[PDB]
Amino acid sequence: DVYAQEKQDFVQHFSQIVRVLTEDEMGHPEIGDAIARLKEVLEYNAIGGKYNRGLTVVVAFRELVEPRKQDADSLQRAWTVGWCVELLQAFFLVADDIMDSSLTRRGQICWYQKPGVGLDAINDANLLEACIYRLLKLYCREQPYYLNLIELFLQSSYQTEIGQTLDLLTAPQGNVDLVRFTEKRYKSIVKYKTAFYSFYLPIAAAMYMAGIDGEKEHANAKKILLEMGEFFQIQDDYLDLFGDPSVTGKIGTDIQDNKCSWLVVQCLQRATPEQYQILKENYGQKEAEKVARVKALYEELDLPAVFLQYEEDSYSHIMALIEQYAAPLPPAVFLGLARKIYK
Amino acid sequence: DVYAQEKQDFVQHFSQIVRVLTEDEMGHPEIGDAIARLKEVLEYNAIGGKYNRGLTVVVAFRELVEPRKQDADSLQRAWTVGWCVELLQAFFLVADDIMDSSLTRRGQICWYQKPGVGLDAINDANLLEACIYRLLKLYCREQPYYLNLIELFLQSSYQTEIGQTLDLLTAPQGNVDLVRFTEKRYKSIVKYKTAFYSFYLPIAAAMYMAGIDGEKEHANAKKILLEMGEFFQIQDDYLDLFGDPSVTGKIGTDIQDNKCSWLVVQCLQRATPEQYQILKENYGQKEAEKVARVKALYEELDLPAVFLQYEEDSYSHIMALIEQYAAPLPPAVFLGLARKIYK
Numbered sequence: 001d002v003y004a005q006e007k008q009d010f011v012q013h014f015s016q017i018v019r020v021l022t023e024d025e026m027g028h029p030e031i032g033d034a035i036a037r038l039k040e041v042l043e044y045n046a047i048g049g050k051y052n053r054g055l056t057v058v059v060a061f062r063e064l065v066e067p068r069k070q071d072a073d074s075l076q077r078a079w080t081v082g083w084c085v086e087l088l089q090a091f092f093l094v095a096d097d098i099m100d101s102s103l104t105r106r107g108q109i110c111w112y113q114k115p116g117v118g119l120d121a122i123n124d125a126n127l128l129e130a131c132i133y134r135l136l137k138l139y140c141r142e143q144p145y146y147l148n149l150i151e152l153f154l155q156s157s158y159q160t161e162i163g164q165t166l167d168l169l170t171a172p173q174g175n176v177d178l179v180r181f182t183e184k185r186y187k188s189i190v191k192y193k194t195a196f197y198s199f200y201l202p203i204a205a206a207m208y209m210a211g212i213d214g215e216k217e218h219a220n221a222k223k224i225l226l227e228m229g230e231f232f233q234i235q236d237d238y239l240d241l242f243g244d245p246s247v248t249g250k251i252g253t254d255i256q257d258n259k260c261s262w263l264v265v266q267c268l269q270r271a272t273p274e275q276y277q278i279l280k281e282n283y284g285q286k287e288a289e290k291v292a293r294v295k296a297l298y299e300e301l302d303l304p305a306v307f308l309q310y311e312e313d314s315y316s317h318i319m320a321l322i323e324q325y326a327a328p329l330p331p332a333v334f335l336g337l338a339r340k341i342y343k
Numbered sequence: 344d345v346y347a348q349e350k351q352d353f354v355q356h357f358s359q360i361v362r363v364l365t366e367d368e369m370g371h372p373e374i375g376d377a378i379a380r381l382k383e384v385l386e387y388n389a390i391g392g393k394y395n396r397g398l399t400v401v402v403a404f405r406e407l408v409e410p411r412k413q414d415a416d417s418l419q420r421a422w423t424v425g426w427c428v429e430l431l432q433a434f435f436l437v438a439d440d441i442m443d444s445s446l447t448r449r450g451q452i453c454w455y456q457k458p459g460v461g462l463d464a465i466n467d468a469n470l471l472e473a474c475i476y477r478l479l480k481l482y483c484r485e486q487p488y489y490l491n492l493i494e495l496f497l498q499s500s501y502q503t504e505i506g507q508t509l510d511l512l513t514a515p516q517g518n519v520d521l522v523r524f525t526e527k528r529y530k531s532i533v534k535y536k537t538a539f540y541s542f543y544l545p546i547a548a549a550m551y552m553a554g555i556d557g558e559k560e561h562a563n564a565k566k567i568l569l570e571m572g573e574f575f576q577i578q579d580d581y582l583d584l585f586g587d588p589s590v591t592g593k594i595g596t597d598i599q600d601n602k603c604s605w606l607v608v609q610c611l612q613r614a615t616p617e618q619y620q621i622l623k624e625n626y627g628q629k630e631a632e633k634v635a636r637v638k639a640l641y642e643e644l645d646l647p648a649v650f651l652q653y654e655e656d657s658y659s660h661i662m663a664l665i666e667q668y669a670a671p672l673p674p675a676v677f678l679g680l681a682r683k684i685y686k
């Protein structure tokens with residue numbers, strides 16, 4: 001497994017990331033205390049996940065750049081850009097946990113729920129984002145791809161925020177939101193909120209790093225990667241309710257938070273009028289008994305088996321897309337990514 | 344007054360800003376509802392202030408670029424970059440109002456206090472930020488200064504967030520924070536949180552637009568502009584308590600929120616031990632009677648007269664800096680800016 005193969009060196013590179021983001025302002029001691037807060041923010045929030053998005057940059061880089069051009073400096077730039085993707089994700093999560101009223105993330109209390117943090121986490125989150133562009137400068141400013149990367153990261157953020165906007169608009173708190181929860185709206189949400197940044201962004205970054213900047217090559221990669229992302233989000237929704245928090249590292253809130261989850265969309269497609277009424281009376285509310293009623297409804301409708309069938313069909317569909325659209329890139333680039341998310 | 348002279352054309356340019364940020368994705372109808380939310384966010388939050396920061400870009404541009412090079416397209420780029428500064432500020436305020444538990448801004452209820460908005464405003468704020476980089480691309484991508492502007496805006500954000508970090512760290516809720524409130528810490532806070540983005544950013548942007556990109560010219564401009572910014576923030580703190588909310592458009596929270604305000608720093612310098620104790624017992628708490636006690640203390644210590652003296656001395660000091668550091672730029676560039684903030 002090529003992700004495990006590159007993991008340790010990537011993770012160990014974190015000290016260097018923290019060191020260069022702390023040391024770059026030893027020349028300005030009056031900001032010492034801000035810098036220490038940044039360090040604490042990085043350490044709590046950018047560590048502890050599975051690093052698949054950052055690692056994807058690195059594995060993809062190795063597979064796309066000719067080995068004779070993989071000098072020490074270029075690898076360092078690749079582990080740095082990988083970390084920039086993880087930092088983007090850290091910004092997103094910290095803010096999302098606040099907006100979702102989440103309890104835990106990566107096996108510990110959400111950063112904003114820490115005593116003494118609260119809504120200060122808003123600024124903490126944005127600092128994680130600013131770190132991306134300082135690292136791109138410190139490590140990549142003299143590279144021909146520098147601007148492409150800056151623009152990639154900015155556009156990825158914009159798309160992602162557009163997708164968060166739809167996530168929030170589709171799920172107003174304290175309303176009955178069932179008529180809003182359609183398959184078409186679902187696919188739009190997850191394309192924008194998850195697929196661009198989680199799948200297109202890391203591979204695209206590696207592409208530009210390798211000097212593959214053609215529009216057609218990016219469009220083809222995107223066809224594969226945006227569909228993987230849609231599956232990834234469906235799985236995220238499944239696990240919100242049915243996954244083991246011991247393994248997910250986080251407690252699910254989709255039902256309480258009234259979300260257009262893949263589960264509620266599949267529920268609506270199947271429910272009788274009587275089942276619809278049950279979902280209407282119990283969805284999007286904080287009472288444990290009501291959440292439990294929704295979960296029972298889902299189980300009565302065999303939504304776990306439906307997801308398992310969907311996963312098999314999605315995997316086949318993605319693999320067909322790889323056959324179609326991978327060339328001229330190594331298919332291994334897409335296949336390693338698929339092996340990581342299906343299972 | 345050159346700011347009034349350029350105001351109407353700048354304000355009217357807002358429709359075009361909103362139109363191009365809405366129209367740039369008529370090709371993607373599935374995001375229609377996100378785009379309408381953006382529009383509502385822009386309209387509530389980027390309108391209604393005095394526009395001094397955005398206008399500064401425009402006035403400075405007119406004064407730095409030879410008139411024969413001020414074609415219609417170049418002016419449009421200048422009004423656009425001005426608006427980008429206002430959009431940065433809109434991002435900052437929306438988030439800051441949440442973190443400060445503010446009530447009103449620009450004569451109306453804070454965006455996050457609107458029923459149905461709440462903490463969704465976190466995402467709204469970040470969308471305002473993303474708009475900056477989409478406008479820089481749509482209007483400036485073919486210009487030699489494009490990268491300079493992107494980097495300027497990113498670095499300005501980072502500095503500003505570093506300054507917000509110190510603002511928050513110096514003012515932990517529910518602690519006695521008086522020992523933390525020194526003049527040295529005060530000057531560091533306001534340099535980073537306010538001066539870079541409010542004064543250096545707009546003029547620097549205009550400079551780069553005019554092809555003035557030399558390090559020495561920027562350092563000299565910065566000496567003037569960072570000190571103006573420090574005065575601007577002191578005045579902001581004075582007005583938090585003593586200004587007319589009818590004119591400021593906003594209710595002050597610095598005392599309740601336990602801030603390292605210029606007022607509390609000057610208080611500590613003057614107070615007897617008995618007065619220190621009064622401030623310790625009443626500062627940083629939500630009770631109206633306690634806030635009122637602090638304000639009386641400030642008045643007993645003639646802090647309004649102290650500020651008026653400070654303002655006169657600061658103005659003289661800034662003007663000396665202009666004599667020193669303005670050349671080779673027109674002094675009018677700095678003087679119009681000063682006329683706007685002193686009075």
Ligand SMILES: O=P(O)(O)C(Nc1cc(-c2ccc(OC3CC3)cc2)ccn1)P(=O)(O)O
Nearest residue numbers: 092095096160161164193194236465466469
């Ligand atoms: O990890 P989860 O399950 O909490 C997912 N988290 C997540 C968050 C985001 C996200 C949230 C808020 C964001 O707001 C930007 C200003 C912060 C951006 C991205 C995008 C994709 N997935 P969710 O969609 O199920 O909430």
Ligand SMILES: O=P(O)(O)C(Nc1cc(-c2ccc(OC3CC3)cc2)ccn1)P(=O)(O)O
Nearest residue numbers: 122123126435438439503504507536537579
């Ligand atoms: O307009 P005010 O008086 O509320 C000022 N507002 C203000 C806000 C900021 C600010 C706040 C939060 C920010 O957080 C970034 C992630 C949002 C950034 C800038 C900077 C300078 N002045 P304050 O400093 O007195 O709160």
Ligand SMILES: [Mg+2]
Nearest residue numbers: 096097100102
């Ligand atoms: Mg969430």
Ligand SMILES: [Mg+2]
Nearest residue numbers: 096099100167
């Ligand atoms: Mg969410």
Ligand SMILES: [Mg+2]
Nearest residue numbers: 236237240254
């Ligand atoms: Mg989820």
Ligand SMILES: [Mg+2]
Nearest residue numbers: 439440443445
């Ligand atoms: Mg404030």
Ligand SMILES: [Mg+2]
Nearest residue numbers: 439442443510
């Ligand atoms: Mg504040």
Ligand SMILES: [Mg+2]
Nearest residue numbers: 579580583597
């Ligand atoms: Mg203030």
